[PDB]
């Protein structure tokens, strides 16, 4: 049984936390709910830690007052079909180890499963640590409250006596690193400097054993992710996300002046040894849009290269964590302010951007943005109960599993089925136009090696390749992006044409240059 | 938002609340959660209360850190049929107008259904307050929320300006009295002294115009009816029940000792003024037979009648207020012992008791409570969830609805067709018992007339009157208990048959001596 | 509210309907039902047409005595995929965009 | 849940099957290709000893009805030790090729 301590010692040397806890909705909860700070409080003094206090960052230390959100998070959706390679026939993007070739992506991309896997999935994915962690069995593939209690009581490590990147197994990749795991936890929050930065209080940095820091680590999408715990209030923690909003200027909505003045963030610092260390950005409104866009966007989370010089840009480089914060018109743009690329593709050679789910940066602008929707609105929406209080439920899943409350109650001239059939007319179209786009990408790639062995000339192929890296830009963001379209349906369909009309402008020149050789 | 208040100030008075609060599972939960005390602890001595604190008896006091809890509680039923009369060829009584005759039942008996209703329900029955309280329409019925929100929030009441209780229409009755409610909501637990004895510290006592106390209720069945809102631990806190158990040292299981011991009760006192006022009952494991038994018992709630000598038994007598906490086989004698009937028959004259849901006392000694069953296993079972945190479900209905966690998890032997077709051979069996119990009972008391105009005298009449009481019992006690011999099927059983045995001396007897008188 | 024209007025020009609309199953169903030729009936010589009359093409113009004909045919099959391109490899032609090169399709 | 567990052993083994045909096919497409570029026929009795166990390693999963899940670890084993299989022949017919280009 838990014991209260006197929150007002603390407050004594924690004026933030004071201003934060005694205002919001948490004014009446106990600091002893996360934190053991029994030495700490008497070894400290006003700016010397002393003893280190143990705070907790398992989700069942707020499960205990809130089980409705907590089980509704947790669940585990049967129907999001696991450990599903995106590059086959039958999914995503049937021609992607062709067009990714030269990635890391190439060993093995699967699409997305619930929430409750994402530190696991992080783990034991082909392309991520060498193969190096798996589950303890098959069997376990299934437990999603076991890898919310812990990735360590489902997952075994192939050597606990080594700690670098290897491969275990022969086709997989070590393309892991810190920044990573920002994305699939924060059990790391008071560890980690702001962007990774290195700082004297910082166990954690860019450039930490990416297989030493894994181990430390817990727990998937800890609630605190969202929610300040001292004050109750919205929040986001991503430092890359505080970069782009708030130290970059660019605002919450880039496209939207007044909407980012009343939908914003304020930056909060916390010191260690009275010089800055982490960052929170408390919102303004309990704003989804920007609370899901600390993870469901385009980012870099790796090494790569300059466009001007080619030279390697290392996990030292800030660049090496960077949210773009662009939509896929600004975004070639974006890269080229940062200097920046991912891989050489292994046949074309051309320098290419590598795109990920860029969710946030797509629905700006978009129909049901521009009309105030948010991505709870369709993805985490309030419970309808004929008797009982309301929650927001907190599985955050694709609308087919709750469409009267996700769209029927603000589309009331629609049944299910005609909601149904608008969701599918926007991603069977703009399916077709991402399987013609890679058509045409595969057809330019095949010619590389014709035209190189024709003796066409290195002006011609490197025109070549600046048409790749549109062409690959323009399609690879909407195999990336999750929805299929449905986000913002017309500006897919803008930038497959553009990716076509790249490959199509690339085939021509290639095939005439391969001609003029023959003849 | 609420903010929290020194509890260490309020423990230099409240020593007893001190001792639950700091040892038990509510120690970090601060007083302004439900008490608003601050004119009070500017105003309070040790010996003097000064100002009256606020006390909240919401059930949204709880459901602010227990959703889950609370949202099962308030779900309605909808298969539980409302306001469907047990007077009815269909329903689980076909003649008990004839039977019941000279009660007030004669007016309304309806069926149960859900906990959320039973306040509003109590107010609007046709036998309670002669049809001064109705639904604000007849729509409200439905609106189980609004009813939990409070009973004067759906609905009206036909003369504000009076508080007698009376007739509004012609067919209802007044038999509602203080003590029902106790039954209802305790909203009241802070104005009523222990039994409702006339005490100088309490608003509401035994001899309380009903009305009036009607409209200080709002709340069904408070949280706080089973766990102590200080120590978040087990209790009772109905004074019936505790002086049942406690004071008259019956014990928790009255037919086993060593259960008793080992789930026992410890009553606690709060006093005003310095003396004793109220009490709870500290249960020593979380006991649900125990706390469903607070008010599913046969109890005397209503004037009466002394078997001695037929005098009226008022609301300010004591046992206006009793459990008699006794199996249907020991319930005569425990009738005998405080010298009471309920009603006389409007037809036969015989001094006859009216029994009311005795399933805590039928539960006694079947097959399951030796087995270390309770109400809770099959009408409260822990959720089962592939993933997520498992709590207690509150909805307490009939286990139909849950088949696998109420029945399946321990007879694994059997399908849920195979469990629902056991409980219907008892059900069906039983209630074949009881209409053939109510058919003999029914020839019996239409004989009384016939040997009235026959001249047969006033000795035979008092032998035929002696036996009605015995063959009341022992049919009524079934069809009061809800499981139609679901809960206790051999004593279901021999009741019945005794029932029957009883009636067909009677007739016998006013046959041979209405013959005679003929002859 | 459609009140009926004089049919026989028609006829003395259009002698093919004539024949067919007396026999058929729509003698009785007036031309106003279809057809505005007030006009047309002033103007029109047997030769030469006038004034045109006004012909409703709508599917309403049937729908008035047959609606569950016009239901029936209304109706959308929503498990008919819309939109669903036949060059992807999940549908009817996995190869077309190669094979149909040069061609709109 | 159980049909979850099938499904995700199927789901892996099954991208695995096909990213081993992916790379089997870069291999076969080159053989035309270096036998047009006069590749010896040393380099390509290599890669067909090569192809004998890229075709095994890979054809063994789309003729066992399982997809996998009657061993699954075996699978995974042996599409991967398929792919390394090809690589390793389309790295030799590559290099092949570009030596009688240059
Ligand atoms: C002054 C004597 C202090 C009192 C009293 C308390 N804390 Fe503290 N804390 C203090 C310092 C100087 C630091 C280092 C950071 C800084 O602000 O300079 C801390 C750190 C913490 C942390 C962070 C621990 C980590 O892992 O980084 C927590 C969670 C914390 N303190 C909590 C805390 C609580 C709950 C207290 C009351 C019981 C408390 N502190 C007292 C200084 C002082
Ligand atoms: C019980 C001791 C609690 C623990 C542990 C946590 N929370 Fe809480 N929370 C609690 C209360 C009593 C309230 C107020 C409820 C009300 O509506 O008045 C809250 C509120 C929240 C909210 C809503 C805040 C708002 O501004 O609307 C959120 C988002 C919330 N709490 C989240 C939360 C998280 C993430 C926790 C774990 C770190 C957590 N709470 C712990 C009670 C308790
Ligand atoms: C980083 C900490 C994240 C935040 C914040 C959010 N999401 Fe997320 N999401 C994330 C990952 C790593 C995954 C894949 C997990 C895995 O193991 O594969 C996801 C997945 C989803 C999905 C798919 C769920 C399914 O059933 O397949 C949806 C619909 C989703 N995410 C939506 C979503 C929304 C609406 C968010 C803000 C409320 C949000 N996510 C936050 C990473 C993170
Ligand atoms: C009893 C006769 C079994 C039947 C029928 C099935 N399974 Fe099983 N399974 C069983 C045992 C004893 C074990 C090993 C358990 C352990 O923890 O040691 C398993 C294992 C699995 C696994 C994990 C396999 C792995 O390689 O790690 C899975 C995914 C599994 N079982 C699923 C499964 C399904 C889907 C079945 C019906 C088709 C099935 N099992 C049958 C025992 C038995
Ligand atoms: C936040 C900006 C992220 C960073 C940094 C990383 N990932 Fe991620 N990941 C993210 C989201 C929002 C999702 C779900 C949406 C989707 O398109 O999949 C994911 C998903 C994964 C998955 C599951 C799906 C899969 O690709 O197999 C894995 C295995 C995964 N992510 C691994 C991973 C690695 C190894 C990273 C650093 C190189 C990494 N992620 C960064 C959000 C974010
Ligand atoms: C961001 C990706 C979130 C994470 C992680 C968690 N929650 Fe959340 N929560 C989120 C949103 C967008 C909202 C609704 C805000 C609005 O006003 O529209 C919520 C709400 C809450 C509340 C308030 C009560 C309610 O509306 O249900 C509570 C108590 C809350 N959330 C708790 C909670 C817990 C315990 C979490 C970890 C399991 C959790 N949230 C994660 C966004 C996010
Ligand atoms: C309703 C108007 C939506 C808003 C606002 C957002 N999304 Fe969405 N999303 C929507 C649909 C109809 C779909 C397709 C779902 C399907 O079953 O066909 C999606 C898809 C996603 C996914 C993939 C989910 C899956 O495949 O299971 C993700 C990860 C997702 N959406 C995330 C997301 C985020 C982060 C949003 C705010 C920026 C967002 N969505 C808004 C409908 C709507
Ligand atoms: C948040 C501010 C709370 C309010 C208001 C109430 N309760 Fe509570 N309760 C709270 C916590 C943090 C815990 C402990 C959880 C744990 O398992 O550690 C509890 C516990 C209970 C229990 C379980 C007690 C036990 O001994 O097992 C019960 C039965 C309980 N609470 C009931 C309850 C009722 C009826 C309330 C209204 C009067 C109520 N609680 C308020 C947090 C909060
Ligand atoms: C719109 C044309 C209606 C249709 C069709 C039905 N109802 Fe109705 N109902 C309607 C109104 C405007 C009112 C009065 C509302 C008010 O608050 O003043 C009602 C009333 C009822 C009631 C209450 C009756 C009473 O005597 O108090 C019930 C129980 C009710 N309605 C139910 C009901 C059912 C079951 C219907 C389908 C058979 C139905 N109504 C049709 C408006 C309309
Ligand atoms: C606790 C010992 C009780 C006292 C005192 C009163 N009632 Fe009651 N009541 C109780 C239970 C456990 C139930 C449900 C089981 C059942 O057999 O019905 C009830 C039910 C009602 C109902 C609804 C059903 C009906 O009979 O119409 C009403 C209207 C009701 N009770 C009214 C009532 C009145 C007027 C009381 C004082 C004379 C009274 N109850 C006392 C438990 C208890
Ligand atoms: C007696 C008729 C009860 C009333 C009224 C309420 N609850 Fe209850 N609760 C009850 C039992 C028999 C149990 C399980 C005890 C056991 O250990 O088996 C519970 C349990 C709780 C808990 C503990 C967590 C859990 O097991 O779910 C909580 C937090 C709790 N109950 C809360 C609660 C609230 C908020 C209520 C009013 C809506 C409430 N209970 C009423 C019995 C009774
Ligand atoms: C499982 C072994 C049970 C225990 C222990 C208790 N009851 Fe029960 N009850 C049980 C059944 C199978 C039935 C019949 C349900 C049906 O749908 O046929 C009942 C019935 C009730 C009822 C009436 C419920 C209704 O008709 O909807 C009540 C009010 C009831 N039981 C209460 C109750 C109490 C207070 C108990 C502990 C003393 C108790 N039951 C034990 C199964 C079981
Ligand atoms: C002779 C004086 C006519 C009378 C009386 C009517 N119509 Fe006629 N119509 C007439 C001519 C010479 C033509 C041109 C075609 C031809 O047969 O030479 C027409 C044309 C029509 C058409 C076709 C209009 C078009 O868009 O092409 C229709 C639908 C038509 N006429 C109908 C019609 C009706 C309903 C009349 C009676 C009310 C009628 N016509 C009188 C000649 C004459
Ligand atoms: C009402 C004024 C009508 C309008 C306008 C149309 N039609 Fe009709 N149709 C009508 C009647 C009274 C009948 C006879 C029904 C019977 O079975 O006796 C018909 C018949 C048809 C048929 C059946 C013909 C056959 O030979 O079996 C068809 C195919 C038909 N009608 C079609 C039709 C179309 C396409 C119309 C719009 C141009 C239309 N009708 C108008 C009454 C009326
Ligand atoms: O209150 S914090 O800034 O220590
Ligand atoms: O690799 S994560 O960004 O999908
Ligand atoms: O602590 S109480 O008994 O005043
Ligand atoms: O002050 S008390 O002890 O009467
Ligand atoms: O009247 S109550 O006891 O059912
Ligand atoms: O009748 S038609 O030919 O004008
Ligand atoms: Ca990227
Ligand atoms: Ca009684």
Same mark, same amino acid.
């Given at each position: 049984?838990?014991?209260?301590?006197?929150?007002?010692?603390?407050?004594?040397?924690?004026?933030?936390?004071?201003?934060?806890?005694?205002?919001?909705?948490?004014?009446?909860?106990?600091?002893?709910?996360?934190?053991?700070?029994?030495?700490?409080?008497?070894?400290?003094?006003?700016?010397?830690?002393?003893?280190?206090?143990?705070?907790?960052?398992?989700?069942?230390?707020?499960?205990?007052?809130?089980?409705?959100?907590?089980?509704?998070?947790?669940?585990?959706?049967?129907?999001?079909?696991?450990?599903?390679?995106?590059?086959?026939?039958?999914?995503?993007?049937?021609?992607?180890?062709?067009?990714?070739?030269?990635?890391?992506?190439?060993?093995?991309?699967?699409?997305?499963?619930?929430?409750?896997?994402?530190?696991?999935?992080?783990?034991?994915?082909?392309?991520?640590?060498?193969?190096?962690?798996?589950?303890?069995?098959?069997?376990?593939?299934?437990?999603?409250?076991?890898?919310?209690?812990?990735?360590?009581?489902?997952?075994?490590?192939?050597?606990?006596?080594?700690?670098?990147?290897?491969?275990?197994?022969?086709?997989?990749?070590?393309?892991?690193?810190?920044?990573?795991?920002?994305?699939?936890?924060?059990?790391?929050?008071?560890?980690?400097?702001?962007?990774?930065?290195?700082?004297?209080?910082?166990?954690?940095?860019?450039?930490?054993?990416?297989?030493?820091?894994?181990?430390?680590?817990?727990?998937?999408?800890?609630?605190?992710?969202?929610?300040?715990?001292?004050?109750?209030?919205?929040?986001?923690?991503?430092?890359?996300?505080?970069?782009?909003?708030?130290?970059?200027?660019?605002?919450?909505?880039?496209?939207?002046?007044?909407?980012?003045?009343?939908?914003?963030?304020?930056?909060?610092?916390?010191?260690?040894?009275?010089?800055?260390?982490?960052?929170?950005?408390?919102?303004?409104?309990?704003?989804?849009?920007?609370?899901?866009?600390?993870?469901?966007?385009?980012?870099?989370?790796?090494?790569?290269?300059?466009?001007?010089?080619?030279?390697?840009?290392?996990?030292?480089?800030?660049?090496?964590?960077?949210?773009?914060?662009?939509?896929?018109?600004?975004?070639?743009?974006?890269?080229?302010?940062?200097?920046?690329?991912?891989?050489?593709?292994?046949?074309?050679?051309?320098?290419?951007?590598?795109?990920?789910?860029?969710?946030?940066?797509?629905?700006?602008?978009?129909?049901?943005?521009?009309?105030?929707?948010?991505?709870?609105?369709?993805?985490?929406?309030?419970?309808?109960?004929?008797?009982?209080?309301?929650?927001?439920?907190?599985?955050?899943?694709?609308? !087919?599993?709750?469409?009267?409350?996700?769209? #029927? =109650?603000?589309?009331? *001239?629609?049944?299910? $089925?005609?909601? &149904? +059939?608008?969701?599918?007319?926007?991603?069977?179209?703009?399916?077709?136009?991402?399987?013609?786009?890679?058509?045409?990408?595969?057809?330019?790639?095949?010619?590389?090696?014709?035209?190189? !062995?024709?003796?066409?000339?290195?002006?011609? #192929? =490197?025109?070549?390749? *600046?048409?790749?890296? $549109?062409?690959? &830009? +323009?399609?690879?963001?909407?195999?990336?992006?999750?929805?299929?379209?449905?986000?913002?349906?017309?500006?897919?369909?803008?930038?497959?044409?553009?990716?076509?009309?790249?490959?199509?402008?690339?085939?021509?020149?290639?095939?005439?240059?391969?001609?003029?050789?023959?003849?």
């Amino acid at each position: 049984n838990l014991k209260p301590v006197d929150a007002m010692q603390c407050f004594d040397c924690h004026t933030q936390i004071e201003d934060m806890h005694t205002v919001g909705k948490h004014a009446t909860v106990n600091c002893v709910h996360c934190h053991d700070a029994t030495e700490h409080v008497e070894t400290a003094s006003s700016r010397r830690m002393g003893e280190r206090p143990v705070t907790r960052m398992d989700l069942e230390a707020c499960a205990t007052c809130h089980t409705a959100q907590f089980n509704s998070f947790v669940e585990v959706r049967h129907e999001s079909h696991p450990r599903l390679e995106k590059a086959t026939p039958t999914s995503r993007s049937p021609m992607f180890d062709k067009l990714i070739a030269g990635h890391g992506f190439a060993f093995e991309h699967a699409e997305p499963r619930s929430h409750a896997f994402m530190l696991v999935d992080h783990f034991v994915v082909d392309r991520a640590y060498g193969g190096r962690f798996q589950f303890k069995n098959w069997q376990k593939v299934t437990d999603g409250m076991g890898a919310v209690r812990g990735a360590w009581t489902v997952l075994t490590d192939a050597d606990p006596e080594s700690s670098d990147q290897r491969r275990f197994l022969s086709q997989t990749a070590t393309a892991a690193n810190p920044v990573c795991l920002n994305c699939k936890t924060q059990d790391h929050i008071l560890d980690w400097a702001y962007m990774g930065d290195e700082h004297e209080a910082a166990k954690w940095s860019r450039t930490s054993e990416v297989v030493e820091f894994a181990r430390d680590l817990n727990h998937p999408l800890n609630c605190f992710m969202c929610h300040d715990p001292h004050s109750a209030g919205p929040r986001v923690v991503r430092d890359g996300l505080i970069n782009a909003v708030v130290d970059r200027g660019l605002g919450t909505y880039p496209h939207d002046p007044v909407k980012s003045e009343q939908q914003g963030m304020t930056k909060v610092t916390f010191q260690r040894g009275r010089e800055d260390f982490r960052a929170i950005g408390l919102l303004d409104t309990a704003d989804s849009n920007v609370m899901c866009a600390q993870c469901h966007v385009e980012y870099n989370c790796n090494p790569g290269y300059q466009l001007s010089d080619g030279s390697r840009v290392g996990m030292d480089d800030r660049r090496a964590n960077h949210f773009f914060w662009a939509n896929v018109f600004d975004y070639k743009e974006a890269a080229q302010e940062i200097d920046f690329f991912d891989f050489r593709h292994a046949t074309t050679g051309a320098a290419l951007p590598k795109l990920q789910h860029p969710e946030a940066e797509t629905f700006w602008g978009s129909v049901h943005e521009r009309n105030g929707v948010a991505c709870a609105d369709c993805h985490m929406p309030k419970v309808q109960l004929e008797n009982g209080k309301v929650y927001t439920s907190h599985s955050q899943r694709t609308p !087919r599993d709750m469409m009267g409350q996700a769209c #029927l =109650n603000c589309h009331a *001239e629609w049944t299910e $089925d005609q909601a &149904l +059939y608008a969701i599918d007319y926007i991603k069977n179209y703009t399916h077709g136009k991402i399987v013609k786009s890679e058509y045409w990408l595969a057809k330019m790639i095949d010619l590389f090696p014709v035209a190189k !062995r024709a003796g066409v000339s290195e002006d011609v #192929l =490197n025109q070549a390749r *600046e048409l790749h890296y $549109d062409a690959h &830009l +323009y399609w690879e963001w909407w195999t990336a992006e999750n929805s299929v379209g449905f986000h913002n349906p017309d500006q897919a369909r803008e930038s497959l044409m553009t990716s076509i009309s790249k490959s199509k402008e690339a085939v021509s020149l290639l095939n005439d240059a391969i001609d003029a050789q023959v003849a």
